Every structure is written in C-alpha cells, then in structure tokens.
Amino acid sequence: MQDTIFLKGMRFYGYHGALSAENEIGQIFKVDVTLKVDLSEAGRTDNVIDTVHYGEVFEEVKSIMEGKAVNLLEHLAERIANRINSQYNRVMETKVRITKENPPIPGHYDGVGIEIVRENK
Amino acid sequence: MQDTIFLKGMRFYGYHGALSAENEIGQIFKVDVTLKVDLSEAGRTDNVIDTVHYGEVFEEVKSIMEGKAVNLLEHLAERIANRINSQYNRVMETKVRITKENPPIPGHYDGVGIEIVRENK
Amino acid sequence: MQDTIFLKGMRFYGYHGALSAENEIGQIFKVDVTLKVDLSEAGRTDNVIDTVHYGEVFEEVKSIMEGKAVNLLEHLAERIANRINSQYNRVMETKVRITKENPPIPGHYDGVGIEIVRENK
Amino acid sequence: MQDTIFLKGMRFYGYHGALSAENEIGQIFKVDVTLKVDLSEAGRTDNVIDTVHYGEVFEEVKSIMEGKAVNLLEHLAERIANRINSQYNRVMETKVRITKENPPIPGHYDGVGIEIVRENK
Amino acid sequence: MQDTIFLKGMRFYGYHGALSAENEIGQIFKVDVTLKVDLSEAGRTDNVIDTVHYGEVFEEVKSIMEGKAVNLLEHLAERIANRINSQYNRVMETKVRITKENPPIPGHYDGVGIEIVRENK
Amino acid sequence: MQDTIFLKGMRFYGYHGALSAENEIGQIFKVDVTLKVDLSEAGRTDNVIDTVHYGEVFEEVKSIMEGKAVNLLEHLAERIANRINSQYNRVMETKVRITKENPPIPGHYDGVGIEIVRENK
Amino acid sequence: MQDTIFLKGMRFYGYHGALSAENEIGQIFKVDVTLKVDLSEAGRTDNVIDTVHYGEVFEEVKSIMEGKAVNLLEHLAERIANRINSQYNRVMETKVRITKENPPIPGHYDGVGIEIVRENK
Amino acid sequence: MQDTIFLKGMRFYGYHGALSAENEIGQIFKVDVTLKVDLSEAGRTDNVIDTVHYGEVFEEVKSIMEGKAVNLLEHLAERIANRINSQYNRVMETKVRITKENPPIPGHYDGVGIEIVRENK
Numbered sequence: 001m002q003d004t005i006f007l008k009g010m011r012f013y014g015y016h017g018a019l020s021a022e023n024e025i026g027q028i029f030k031v032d033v034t035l036k037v038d039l040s041e042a043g044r045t046d047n048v049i050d051t052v053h054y055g056e057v058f059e060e061v062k063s064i065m066e067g068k069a070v071n072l073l074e075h076l077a078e079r080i081a082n083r084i085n086s087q088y089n090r091v092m093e094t095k096v097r098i099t100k101e102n103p104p105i106p107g108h109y110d111g112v113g114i115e116i117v118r119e120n121k
Numbered sequence: 122m123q124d125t126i127f128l129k130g131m132r133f134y135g136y137h138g139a140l141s142a143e144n145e146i147g148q149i150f151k152v153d154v155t156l157k158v159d160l161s162e163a164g165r166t167d168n169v170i171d172t173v174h175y176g177e178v179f180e181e182v183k184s185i186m187e188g189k190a191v192n193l194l195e196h197l198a199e200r201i202a203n204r205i206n207s208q209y210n211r212v213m214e215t216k217v218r219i220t221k222e223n224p225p226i227p228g229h230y231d232g233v234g235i236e237i238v239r240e241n242k
Numbered sequence: 243m244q245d246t247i248f249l250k251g252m253r254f255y256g257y258h259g260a261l262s263a264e265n266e267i268g269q270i271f272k273v274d275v276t277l278k279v280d281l282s283e284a285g286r287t288d289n290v291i292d293t294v295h296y297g298e299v300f301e302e303v304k305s306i307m308e309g310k311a312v313n314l315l316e317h318l319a320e321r322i323a324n325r326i327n328s329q330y331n332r333v334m335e336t337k338v339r340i341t342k343e344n345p346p347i348p349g350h351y352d353g354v355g356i357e358i359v360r361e362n363k
Numbered sequence: 364m365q366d367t368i369f370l371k372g373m374r375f376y377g378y379h380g381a382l383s384a385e386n387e388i389g390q391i392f393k394v395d396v397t398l399k400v401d402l403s404e405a406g407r408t409d410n411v412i413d414t415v416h417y418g419e420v421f422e423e424v425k426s427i428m429e430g431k432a433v434n435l436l437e438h439l440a441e442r443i444a445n446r447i448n449s450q451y452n453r454v455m456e457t458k459v460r461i462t463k464e465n466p467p468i469p470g471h472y473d474g475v476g477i478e479i480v481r482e483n484k
Numbered sequence: 485m486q487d488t489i490f491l492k493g494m495r496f497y498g499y500h501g502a503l504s505a506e507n508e509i510g511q512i513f514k515v516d517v518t519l520k521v522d523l524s525e526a527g528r529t530d531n532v533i534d535t536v537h538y539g540e541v542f543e544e545v546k547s548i549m550e551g552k553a554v555n556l557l558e559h560l561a562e563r564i565a566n567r568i569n570s571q572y573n574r575v576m577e578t579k580v581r582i583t584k585e586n587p588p589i590p591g592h593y594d595g596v597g598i599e600i601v602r603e604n605k
Numbered sequence: 606m607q608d609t610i611f612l613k614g615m616r617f618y619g620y621h622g623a624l625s626a627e628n629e630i631g632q633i634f635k636v637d638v639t640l641k642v643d644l645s646e647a648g649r650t651d652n653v654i655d656t657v658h659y660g661e662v663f664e665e666v667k668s669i670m671e672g673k674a675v676n677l678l679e680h681l682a683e684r685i686a687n688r689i690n691s692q693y694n695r696v697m698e699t700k701v702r703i704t705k706e707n708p709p710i711p712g713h714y715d716g717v718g719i720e721i722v723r724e725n726k
Numbered sequence: 727m728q729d730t731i732f733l734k735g736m737r738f739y740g741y742h743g744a745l746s747a748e749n750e751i752g753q754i755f756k757v758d759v760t761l762k763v764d765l766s767e768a769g770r771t772d773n774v775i776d777t778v779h780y781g782e783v784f785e786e787v788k789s790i791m792e793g794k795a796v797n798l799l800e801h802l803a804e805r806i807a808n809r810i811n812s813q814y815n816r817v818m819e820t821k822v823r824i825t826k827e828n829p830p831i832p833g834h835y836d837g838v839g840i841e842i843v844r845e846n847k
Numbered sequence: 848m849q850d851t852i853f854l855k856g857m858r859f860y861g862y863h864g865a866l867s868a869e870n871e872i873g874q875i876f877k878v879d880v881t882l883k884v885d886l887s888e889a890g891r892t893d894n895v896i897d898t899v900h901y902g903e904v905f906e907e908v909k910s911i912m913e914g915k916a917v918n919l920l921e922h923l924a925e926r927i928a929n930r931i932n933s934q935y936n937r938v939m940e941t942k943v944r945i946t947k948e949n950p951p952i953p954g955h956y957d958g959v960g961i962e963i964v965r966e967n968k
C-alpha cells in the first residue's frame with residue numbers, strides 16, 4: 001500500500017531551540033508531513049468522510065509548532081506524529097520532517113533538521 | 122523492472138474541492154504521473170509504437186482535471202490512474218500525485234495533496 | 243537622494259477582494275514596501291534612533307493586511323502608504339506594491355497586482 | 364505619477380513565429396503587462412469601478428496570445444497595447460513585454476523577446 | 485551497496501523526436517545519469533584511477549545527445565546506458581533519465597520524459 | 606522611445622580571465638543584451654524585415670563569447686556592443702551585461718560582473 | 727555614463743543588529759554592490775589595470791561584513807561605500823544594498839534591508 | 848528504523864580536484880549528510896544529550912571540506928563518513944553526498960558528484 005496524503009513546506013515562526021538566544025529571537029521552522037493512508041475508498045466514493053482532512057492536519061501541526069517552545073526538533077516531531085496517529089485511525093503511519101533553514105550555525109547551507117517515521121498503533 | 126515514463130508538474134485550473142467557494146473560484150492543481158513501463162523494446166527499436174505516448178497521457182489527465190468538478194483529489198487521481206491503466210496494457214502500474222499549492226488553508230506552506238499507486242490489472 | 247529602506251516579499255493570508263467567494267476563502271497577498279529615507283545620519287552614528295525601524299514598519303503593514311477585508315488592493319496600499327507616511331517624518335516617500343499571486347483568474351501567470359508611490363506631506 | 368497596475372508572467376501556448384515549424388509545433392509565450400494608471404481615487408473609494416480590472420486585462424491579453432498566429436512578437440505586443448489603450452481611458456500608457464523562453468535558437472539562455480511602451484492617445 | 489556517481493541536469497540542444505517539426509526546430513533535452521559504483525577503494529586511495537571519471541561520462545552522454553536525431557527518448561537512454569556499461573566494468577548498473585521540458589504538448593507542465601535502469605552484464 | 610529587444614541569461618562556457626588557471630579551466634559566462642530599437646513599424650507590419658533578428662544577435666554574442674580568450678569582461682562586452690551596433694543601424698543603443706557566477710573568488714555570492722551601455726553612432 | 731561593475735548576492739555570516747540576541751546568535755547578511763565606473767578604456771585595452779578589480783572589492787566588503795558587529799545595516803553600508811570610494815578614484819559612485827533575509831521579525835517575508843548611494847568625492 | 852538527522856546544501860569553497868588548475872583556483876563544493884539515528888528517546892525526553900548535535904556534525908564536515916586539498920570527492924566523503932561514524936555511536940549509518948556544481952567540464956549541467964553510504968561498525 002503506497003498511497004499517501006501530504007503537506008509540504010509548512011512554515012511557522014517559532015521559538016524552539018536548545019539555545020537561550022534562539023528561544024528569545026525565534027526563527028522559521030519548515031515542516032513536511034506524509035501520511036500513509038489507504039485512499040481507494042475515497043477514490044471510489046468521492047466522499048470527504050472516507051479520507052483524512054489535510055486542513056485538520058495542518059491545524060494540528062500548527063498548534064504544536066506555534067505553541068510552547070521546546071529544545072528539540074525531535075520532540076516537536078514526536079508530538080506531531082503522536083498527535084496525528086492518535087486522532088486518525090486511518091493513518092497507518094506518520095512521517096514528520098522538520099527543517100531549520102537558519103539555525104545558529106556559522107556557515108552556508110540550505111538547512112539542517114530531522115525526520116522521523118512513526119507507525120500508528 | 123525500474124523503467125518509468127513520467128509527466129511532471131502538469132498544471133490545470135480546475136474547480137474541484139469540498140467547499141462551495143472553491144467550486145466557484147477554482148484554483149491551480151499540480152499533477153505528477155509516473156508510469157511503470159518496460160522500455161527496452163522501444164530502446165531497441167526506436168519505434169514510437171513500442172512505448173506509451175506521453176502526449177496521449179497528458180490529454181487524458183487534462184480531460185479529467187479540466188472536466189467536471191469533484192470533491193476530492195483522491196477521486197480525481199483514482200479516475201486518472203484508472204483511465205491510464207485501462208487504455209494502456211503496457212503500463213504495469215500508475216502513480217498519480219495531485220497537489221493543491223493554494224487551498225483554502227490559512228497558512229504558509231508549499232502545498233498539500235495526495236499520491237496514489239494503482240497496479241494495472 | 244537615492245537611499246531607501248525596504249521590506250520585500252511580505253506574505254499575509256487575507257480576505258480582500260471584490261468577489262464574495264474571495265472574502266470567504268481568502269488567499270496569500272504579497273507586499274513590497276520601499277521607503278525613501280536619508281540614511282547618512284544613521285550611517286554616521288550607528289544609532290538606531292536616526293533611522294526608521296523595519297520591524298515597526300512590518301507591524302504596520304501586517305495590521306492592515308491581516309485586518310478587515312476590503313475590495314481593492316488599491317485601497318490596501320493607500321492605507322499602508324498613508325499609515326507609514328503619517329507615523330514617520332523621515333520617510334520622504336512610500337512605495338507599496340501588492341501582488342495577488344493566485345487571484346480568481348482562470349489562467350497561468352506569476353501574479354497580478356498594483357503599485358503606488360505616495361510622497362510624505 | 365508612478366502608480367501602476369501589473370500582470371506578471373502570464374503564460375500562453377501559441378503558434379506565433381516567422382518559422383513554419385514554429386507555427387506547426389507552437390511554444391509557450393510569457394507576457395508582462397504594466398499599466399500606468401492613477402490609483403488614488405480607488406485608493407480613497409475602494410470602489411472597483413474607479414480602477415482598471417486586472418481580470419479583464421488578462422482576458423484581452425489571452426484573446427490575442429491564444430488567437431491567430433502572427434510572425435512577430437512586435438506585432439503581438441502592438442495589438443495588446445493598442446487593445447488595452449483603446450478600451451481603458453484611465454490607462455495613461457501600456458508597457459508590454461513578451462518573452463520566448465524556448466525559441467528555435469541552438470543555445471543555452473533564459474529567454475529572448477521584446478518590450479514596447481505605448482502611451483494612450 | 486548504495487554508492488553512486490551522478491551527473492545532474494545535463495542540458496543539450498538536440499533534434500530528437502517522432503515529429504518532423506521537432507527534428508527541424510530542435511529543443512533542449514535534460515539528462516540525469518546515476519551510476520552504481522563501489523567507491524570505497526577510491527575513498528581509501530584517493531587515486532583517480534580507482535573510480536569512474538565524471539568528465540568522461542559527460543562526454544559519452546554528450547556525443548549521443550548531440551549526435552544523430554532519433555525518434556525516442558527511450559532509444560537515446562538505451563544507447564547511453566549501453567555506452568556507459570560497455571566502457572566501465574566498475575559500473576554495476578546505469579540509470580538514465582531524460583526530460584523534454586518543452587515538447588510539442590499544448591499545455592502547462594514542468595516536463596515529460598522517461599527513466600531507465602540497466603544493470604551492467 | 607522605450608522599446609527594446611532583449612536576450613536574457615545567455616550562457617557560454619569560455620576561457621576568459623586575467624588568471625592563467627582561469628584560461629586553462631574555463632567557466633560559464635552569463636550574458637544579457639538589451640537593444641534600444643523602435644519597434645512600431647514591425648508592430649504595424651508584422652514583417653520580420655522591419656526589426657532586428659534575436660537569433661542573429663545571439664549568434665554574434667556567441668561568436669565572441671566562445672571565441673578567443675581575453676582578460677576582461679569589459680573587453681568582451683565592448684566587442685559585443687560594437688559588433689551589434691556596427692551591423693544593425695536600427696539599434697540606437699546596446700546594453701551588455703556579463704556575469705561570472707563562479708569566478709576565482711573565495712566566497713559565497715551569486716555573481717560578479719560588469720554592464721556597459723554604448724550608443725550606436 | 728551608464729557603465730557599472732557589480733557584485734551580487736554576497737553572503738556573510740555576521741553578528742550585527744541592535745538586539746543583544748542577534749549579536750549572540752548572528753545571521754546571514756546579503757550584500758549587493760554596484761559601482762559606477764567608466765569601462766571604455768578597459769573595453770579598448772583589455773588591460774586589467776584600467777578597471778576596478780571585482781576581487782579586491784569583495785575583499786573590502788568581506789572585511790567589513792565579517793568584522794566587528796555594529797547595530798545598523800545603515801552603518802555597515804556607509805562603511806563599505808566609504809571604503810570603496812576612498813580606495814578607487816575610478817569609482818564615480820557606490821551603491822550598497824544590504825538585506826537581512828532572516829531578521830528577528832515574526833513573520834513571513836523574503837527580506838528586509840536598506841540601500842544607499844554615495845558619490846565619490 | 849527510518850529516523851534520520853540531516854544537513855542539506857552545506858557549501859564550502861575548497862581546492863580539491865585531480866587537476867592542478869582546480870587546486871589553484873578552487874570552487875564551491877556542495878555537501879548533503881544524512882545520518883541514520885534512532886530519535887525516539889530524544890523525542891520522549893527533549894534532552895539534547897539523547898541525540899546527535901547538527902552543529903557538531905557541520906563542524907566536522909567543514910574541517911574536512913575546508914582543509915587539505917585532495918584529488919577525489921570519494922576520498923573527501925570517505926573521510927567525512929568515517930569521522931562522523933567514529934565520534935557518534937548513535938549514528939547507525941552515514942550517507943554523504945558531495946556535488947561539484949561547477950567542475951572543469953565544458954558544458955551545461957546542474958552538477959556532478961558522488962554519494963556514499965557507510966554503516967557505523
């Protein structure tokens with residue numbers, strides 16, 4: 001089963017980071033969420049109730065990304081995957097990628113970040 | 122067998138969406154289609170009749186994307202995969218990705234969408 | 243005097259537009275603001291009090307772009323130029339460009355919009 | 364008076380070109396239109412009737428770009444400027460830029476084209 | 485063994501295509517080549533003779549892409565994979581992707597093309 | 606008279622540069638040419654003989670950019686402007702911009718270069 | 727005289743900013759420098775000694791951008807323009823644009839900054 | 848286990864290359880590093896000590912990329928993978944991609960390079 005529902009390049013201004021100054025100034029966090037969902041019923045029915053609402057997922061990601069500042073991207077993604085898996089039984093597995101395009105790293109790069117994959121139990 | 126025929130970033134202005142206002146205003150839909158096709162005969166012969174015509178595939182996608190408005194991206198992709206699989210026996214499997222880069226979601230992101238993979242029976 | 247202070251590609255999700263459906267769904271508005279300001283004193287002093295604060299300007303633009311929905315981009319830009327000119331005497335003239343990259347126009351384009359230039363009286 | 368109304372990166376697939384093969388195959392034409400229009404009344408009133416409708420302008424450009432094939436970009440732009448100037452008295456001057464990003468020129472470049480500026484008489 | 489040597493976005497102006505007009509006018513062909521090669525010896529030695537020369541590979545691709553016009557992308561890629569596999573025993577497998585970003589297809593898309601994977605016998 | 610004919614982002618691999626190593630290795634040179642030409646006759650007539658051929662201009666630029674290596678970008682642009690002005694009486698003035706996106710400068714930048722404007726005598 | 731020598735998109739990681747946290751964490755500063763220089767002698771001679779060395783200019787910009795942290799972009803640009811004007815008599819005027827693409831401003835934008843133009847006395 | 852920590856598009860100006868002239872002039876090297884690391888503990892704890900520090904990894908890559916010039920990209924990547932695997936036991940495997948976007952290859956392409964994957968022993 002290779003069907004997926006995705007939300008790409010979601011950007012949020014947040015205050016996460018292990019560094020005091022980061023928590024103070026903040027920065028933009030980029031988030032990609034890919035959900036493993038069987039979409040054949042919805043493909044047949046065309047009834048919005050047979051699939052997972054992208055809009056609702058964005059709201060969940062947003063509430064976590066624009067909420068309380070935490071130290072790690074690992075913790076933010078764990079909370080997002082866990083939030084999506086908990087509320088949608090149709091999601092067989094959740095992939096969350098978070099990128100800091102402008103972290104406190106003296107250099108020239110496109111971004112740094114993490115990616116996790118959590119199956120829905 | 123890892124050979125594929127692809128059509129990337131096809132853009133169509135359509136009226137699909139579960140929201141009345143979407144159906145009224147419309148938006149641009151981005152579509153990626155990847156077809157699993159054994160291309161060694163055509164690679165040998167160079168005869169256009171031994172492969173699947175990209176132009177014809179685009180026409181099929183277009184007729185569906187610019188046709189009657191439906192609620193879901195899931196339904197649009199199901200119709201496209203089913204249309205391609207039905208008319209081309211050489212296509213072993215069809216992957217259809219549809220992205221709404223500008224859906225009615227208050228936020229900053231690159232796009233939202235779905236992706237399905239349907240083997241040709 | 244060719245010195246300027248600028249804010250490029252500011253993006254806001256708003257509900258402006260002459261069409262009911264636009265007001266309902268909303269869309270992203272892109273805004274460029276260029277201010278004619280003599281920057282030699284600040285270039286000499288390095289004292290933030292001798293120039294116009296980009297951060298404060300962004301806040302002004304934001305309050306207007308994310309506020310009450312109006313029909314025209316012309317009206318939004320007039321309000322922004324007027325807001326900036328009114329609060330900063332050092333701004334000799336304000337240029338405001340607003341782009342709707344995804345208006346209700348069935349077609350393929352990069353964007354549509356307006357640009358105004360208002361001298362500070 | 365530096366106010367303008369603009370339409371950027373409009374893309375149309377057409378068959379214009381002095382070469383037979385071009386007329387046969389076609390290509391994408393990119394068009395930028397900038398109109399000199401005094402926008403202060405509309406900025407005051409917020410009444411759509413006090414400005415020039417971007418949507419209507421796009422329709423005009425489209426009808427010319429997707430219509431009968433001609434030899435020159437110069438002729439296409441002359442027809443567009445003339446069409447806009449004729450129907451809108453508020454347009455003091457029309458600038459039309461047309462780019463062939465992929466003309467029959469053996470080489471590597473971003474595009475070739477012309478730009479004209481026609482005052483409204 | 486997941487090591488690879490790659491050449492991305494190689495662009496050549498050629499005259500390939502099943503349509504007479506294409507052969508006459510030509511267009512830009514984009515080519516991506518990925519070679520499966522064990523790079524640990526070279527990683528140890530740092531001796532250029534223990535790996536496959538990217539420059540030589542580009543020359544091979546070029547000679548085929550800028551040579552005699554053929555009908556299919558399938559045939560061009562088959563010739564490239566076969567050319568690389570034949571001359572380099574260290575290449576365990578060759579992947580060739582060819583994209584026509586501007587084919588004679590009336591529409592808006594990013595590109596169309598094929599991709600093949602050929603193991604070296 | 607604000608009409609212009611332009612060729613943007615022409616790229617050529619050349620060996621120009623004041624440094625021996627540059628002459629040996631080479632690099633990509635990016636060239637923009639803007640010609641001041643009255644395009645109203647051609648806009649009226651649609652006859653290719655009433656304007657300046659973009660294709661011919663590209664050929665001229667190419668012959669200079671891919672020819673004998675010289676030390677300066679200033680000299681290359683002077684030769685191009687002079688070549689275009691000499692062969693086309695309809696060109697009232699020629700602007701030539703040449704960019705070295707990857708010169709032997711240890712740093713991070715988008716490009717360095719020169720731009721000249723030469724009226725046709 | 728419209729000839730210019732330019733350096734575009736120079737990027738430096740620095741610690742400038744009126745905010746303590748900025749000075750602590752730092753960020754990338756983007757700089758564009760355009761110099762008004764008569765390039766006809768060099769265009770004639772092809773002798774590097776008749777023009778201004780882009781490499782030397784970059785070094786000057788770099789020494790200022792990667793040096794002591796100051797509060798304002800206005801001060802940094804004033805120092806750069808003044809440094810270039812002082813060391814090169816052939817530079818009739820220096821334009822310096824500095825952009826903070828990621829300042830401590832909670833929002834979505836492309837960048838904020840200033841631009842100054844200083845004639846060489 | 849599909850969790851990863853990544854650093855994308857790191858750019859360094861170095862002098863690596865098998866050609867004398869390359870070693871003399873230098874060029875920009877682009878590096879992507881993907882680390883296979885189990886991130887669930889850190890996702891639970893939010894304690895920076897339970898994961899691998901992206902900043903420290905960048906420093907390692909940098910020290911190798913901006914250090915002594917070597918002939919091959921294969922050798923540079925082998926040293927990086929080996930450096931990361933050696934210092935971090937939590938890294939189960941290291942993927943290093945190095946791209947020369949502007950090598951001494953007369954042509955038009957996006958880049959050439961290699962990619963290696965080394966499990967941590």
Ligand SMILES: Nc1nc(O)c2nn(-c3cccc(C(=O)NCc4ccccc4Sc4ccccc4CO)c3)nc2n1
Pocket residue numbers: 017018019071072073074103104105106751852895898899900901902903906
């Ligand atoms: N795995 C992970 N996940 C997160 O969410 C993290 N947040 N930080 C984090 C915490 C504290 C500092 C930094 C940071 O980027 N520091 C950059 C830096 C780190 C280590 C060593 C050097 C540097 S930069 C440097 C080095 C030498 C001189 C001057 C500088 C610039 O400050 C990041 N690391 C994370 N790792």
Ligand SMILES: Nc1nc(O)c2nn(-c3cccc(C(=O)NCc4ccccc4Sc4ccccc4CO)c3)nc2n1
Pocket residue numbers: 005048051052053054055056059138139140192193194195224225226227267
């Ligand atoms: N899986 C899927 N597939 C499709 O094809 C869909 N079309 N829509 C769809 C239908 C109705 C509404 C929307 C939509 O994007 N609504 C966005 C939204 C949804 C849910 C909750 C909030 C919001 S936005 C919001 C929230 C609070 C205040 C103000 C707003 C902006 O309207 C999308 N959802 C789909 N899901």
Ligand SMILES: Nc1nc(O)c2nn(-c3cccc(C(=O)NCc4ccccc4Sc4ccccc4CO)c3)nc2n1
Pocket residue numbers: 146259260261313314315316345346347348368411414415416417418419422
């Ligand atoms: N100068 C200006 N400023 C603003 O802020 C505006 N907002 N709108 C606005 C208001 C109402 C409708 C639209 C709009 O874009 N409509 C697009 C459209 C307009 C006119 C004619 C045709 C079309 S699209 C079309 C045409 C034929 C068939 C189907 C369609 C798609 O609806 C925009 N126009 C503005 N002009």
Ligand SMILES: Nc1nc(O)c2nn(-c3cccc(C(=O)NCc4ccccc4Sc4ccccc4CO)c3)nc2n1
Pocket residue numbers: 380381382434435436437466467468469509610653656657658659660661664
């Ligand atoms: N000012 C202007 N405006 C237009 O609208 C034009 N359409 N064409 C046009 C007409 C006929 C041919 C071409 C074209 O691009 N030909 C390219 C070309 C022209 C002249 C000389 C050489 C070439 S390409 C070439 C050269 C040598 C060998 C092989 C080739 C590839 O065919 C363009 N020129 C225009 N000029």
Ligand SMILES: Nc1nc(O)c2nn(-c3cccc(C(=O)NCc4ccccc4Sc4ccccc4CO)c3)nc2n1
Pocket residue numbers: 126169172173174175176177180388501502503555556557558587588589590
């Ligand atoms: N698998 C494959 N590989 C190649 O290398 C190919 N080259 N062509 C090829 C050959 C002949 C024509 C075309 C082409 O793109 N034609 C586009 C087109 C094809 C089929 C049906 C319609 C169209 S476009 C169209 C349709 C209706 C009206 C007007 C038009 C524009 O001409 C491409 N097809 C290939 N397929």
Ligand SMILES: Nc1nc(O)c2nn(-c3cccc(C(=O)NCc4ccccc4Sc4ccccc4CO)c3)nc2n1
Pocket residue numbers: 622623624676677678679708709710711731774777778779780781782785872
């Ligand atoms: N106006 C102009 N026009 C041209 O066409 C030029 N070609 N070169 C040119 C000639 C010789 C060297 C270079 C070059 O870019 N050198 C870069 C450099 C120049 C001056 C000072 C330092 C550097 S880089 C540097 C500095 C210190 C240590 C290590 C390095 C890297 O080599 C360029 N300069 C031009 N100027």
Ligand SMILES: Nc1nc(O)c2nn(-c3cccc(C(=O)NCc4ccccc4Sc4ccccc4CO)c3)nc2n1
Pocket residue numbers: 025247290293294295296297298301743744745797798799800829830831832
């Ligand atoms: N003209 C100019 N030049 C420079 O070089 C400047 N550096 N700063 C500067 C100094 C201090 C703070 C900031 C900054 O961007 N602050 C952003 C901000 C400023 C003013 C008001 C609000 C904000 S953001 C905000 C607002 C409300 C709640 C939360 C936040 C996020 O901190 C920038 N301003 C400059 N102006």
Ligand SMILES: Nc1nc(O)c2nn(-c3cccc(C(=O)NCc4ccccc4Sc4ccccc4CO)c3)nc2n1
Pocket residue numbers: 489532535536537538539540543630864865866918919920921950951952953
């Ligand atoms: N696998 C690998 N890894 C590295 O790190 C390499 N560095 N070089 C390397 C060494 C020496 C030369 C070049 C180079 O790119 N040369 C380009 C070139 C190579 C072979 C054949 C032709 C050419 S370009 C050419 C051809 C004909 C005429 C004129 C030219 C331009 O010089 C690269 N090759 C590598 N391969």
